Amino acid sequence: IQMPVFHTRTIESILEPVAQQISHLVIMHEEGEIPDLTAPVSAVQAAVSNLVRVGKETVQTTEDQILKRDMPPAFIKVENACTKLVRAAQMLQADPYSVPARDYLIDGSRGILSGTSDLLLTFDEAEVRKIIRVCKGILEYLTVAEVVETMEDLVTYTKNLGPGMTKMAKMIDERQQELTHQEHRVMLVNSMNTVKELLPVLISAMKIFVTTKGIEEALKNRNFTVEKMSAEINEIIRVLQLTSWD
């Protein structure tokens, strides 16, 4: 049963060469048939130790409570993986033909891969939550557009909404370029393009409403623009959270 495609291009670039080399090793094990592996194992231990260290600093100094809960079990997984690598090297010094040593090199390798994957994904989910909080900020501020009655309110509204929109567009653009799923990139870009092209429509609509206060047409055109922008933003929030069983 096939291993899924990695979630983003960054994670892919880091983990794919590992995943492939392990597959090669497994094939060697199942098919056909040795220097002292004590030093390169120690190098892996060192690397993993440093990773866990940086991970702990990230955990202690973050404000994402979900990230605090989900990341630390990845530390345990990779440290446990290193243990198997250490045992494998020790076994091989005793017997270069050791089969359990081979199973350990494979299991330990997979453990590091699986754990490094968990750590990367859990951080990626935290990065996504930041984008979502911004998007939901826009949604909340789109509802207060129905409160703007005076021209000075409109000036204050636009000055607050404007930079919020620009930030959201930058985040979505940066995020779409990282996805390994093309349909998701398309849905994100199409939705964001619609939102940006409805922004001047929304501003002009309530400008008419403010000045006219034919208010009925301007009233409804404003509302319809809001609810359409909101619909598009909600669509973005969903696509951002997509790991397809959907």
Add this chain to the structure above:
Amino acid sequence: RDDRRERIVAECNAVRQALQDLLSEYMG
């Protein structure tokens, strides 16, 4: 820009590098 992200990616790459070196030494 996102230095917290960069630091994590760098550490994971260092883990990748050491593991690949280990596996390469074994596979020849």
